[PDB]
Amino acid sequence: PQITLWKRPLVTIKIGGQLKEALLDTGADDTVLEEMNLPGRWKPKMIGGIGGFIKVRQYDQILIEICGHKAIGTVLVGPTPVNIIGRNLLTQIGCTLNF
């Protein structure tokens, strides 16, 4: 679809068998999701933005459905204030910015 930016670009996603709301975020290189107990191995990582860094768990090859579009890639899990869909998955659903 076409999403305008008058309001925060929040969409429904499906991950690990669960439905969540998440932000379509062109400023995020990576996808960062709220604390969740996902199965499988993971690696520690730190990611930074305004205000400094947070500690996250990096899971690879995770399937996410974003408004009915499927994507597979790295997902970071940690104490983020909002679920963020970053460029690593936005490219997979063919998301572009248009002005």
Q: Looking at the DSSP assignment, which residues form a beta bridge with residue 15?
A: 18, 64
> 54 is in the binding site of which of a second copy, ligand XUM, none (Cβ under 5 to 8 A by kind)?
a second copy
Q: Does 91 sit near ligand XUM (CB under 6 A)?
A: no
Closer Cβ to ligand XUM, 28 or 90, answer by number: 28
Closer Cβ to a second copy, 22 or 62, answer by number: 22
The token pair at 5 is 């930016």
What are φ and ψ of residue 87, in 5° steps?
-60, -30
> 9 is in the binding site of which of a second copy, ligand XUM, none (Cβ under 5 to 8 A by kind)?
a second copy
Q: Does 15 sit near ligand XUM (CB under 6 A)?
A: no
